[PDB]
């Protein structure tokens, strides 16, 4: 079963999917192919919690009906000592026009 | 194979290449990074969410859910979608 | 041209609304005129008595947005009941945006800050008669 994710670090945001049965380390292999960083220099997070390499995305709370295509779940990324988990927020939308 | 779509505020969105080829405009601006001077991150992130949404539910039999658009981003997303023809 | 065939052969149909919209069923009579039927709340179904060769299309009852039935625009009851699976289509991002903006701004359309061609897109509401000439 597919889960749809946003892997985010600093001002980087990767849109990808993975199997619910796939492991955290296997996600780091996906990140490795894109950002060219080995998994040992990678740290994956759900919100603030550090994720274990051997656990599957489903055990980590990334389920199909919470990681939707039109609303993907966020996986925090941190590079290596290790930096602190930093995710730059998106820009703020303007005020609603008077006609809305 | 991936491509980078950079918003106006520096945010870098890395999506699959075939997802970005959905928009005919983005294919032209690639023919591999693309900068969007007029699309902020709170609009381009929604655009990338639509790429996954379109590819997943096109030619699909399971019930299709509504693509959610907050009111505060509807006007900007409309101009971006009109420009990108997506 | 787009009209129902007066075959007088009954065909039992189940209108199945698998969409978050209020579905307005539209029967095309023997002169091509669109005839509206009672609406279906989201997720609700209805057993209707139609006929073979008859033409049905379904829209959003409030906004007349186009909807799919069995992954197509037109639904024709055949020989027996036949399931009429009404679902949302994969709207383009532009049309989906027009839908949301239309639902928030009163047809104050010109007061928005957009290009002039976007005002005409907002005013060009989805309409059954316009789509009939298209098909
Ligand atoms: C009124 C401020 O909003 C914009 O100017 C704008 C926002 C956006 O997200 O995408 C655009 C695409 C365009 O081609 C032209 C303009 C925009």
Numbering used by the authors:
A (entry chain A): 1 to 80, 84 to 103
B (entry chain B): 17 to 47, 58 to 112
C (entry chain C): 62 to 141, 146 to 172, 174 to 201
Please quote the paper that reports this structure.
To determine the crystal structures of VBC in complexes with coumarin derivative compounds, we attempted co-crystallization and soaking with each of the 25 compounds (2–5 mM of 25 purchasable coumarin derivatives). Successful results were obtained using soaking for 7HC_1(DE22) and 7HC_5(D3), and co-crystallization for 7HC_2(D7). Similar to the previously reported VBC structures, four VBC complex molecules existed in the asymmetric unit of the crystal. The 7HC_1(DE22) molecule was modeled in three chains (B, H, and K), VBC−7HC_2(D7) was modeled in all four chains (B, E, H, and K), and 7HC_5(D3) was modeled in only one chain (the K chain). Our molecules bound to the previously reported “ELOC site”, to which some small molecules and cullin-2 (CUL2)-derived peptides can bind. Met105 participated in hydrophobic interactions in all seven ELOC structures of 7HC_1(DE22) and 7HC_2(D7) (chains B, H, and K in 7HC_1(DE22); chains B, E, H, and K in 7HC_2(D7)). Hydrophobic interactions between the benzopyran moiety and Glu102 were missing in one ELOB structure (chain B of 7HC_2(D7)) but were retained in the other six ELOC structures. Ile65−benzopyran interactions were found in chain-H structures of 7HC_1(DE22) and 7HC_2(D7). The 2-oxo group of each 7HC derivative formed a polar interaction with the main-chain carbonyl group of Glu102, and the 7-hydroxy group also interacted with the side chain of Glu64. When we superimposed our three 7HC structures with the VBC−MB235 complex structures, the ligand-binding sites were identical.
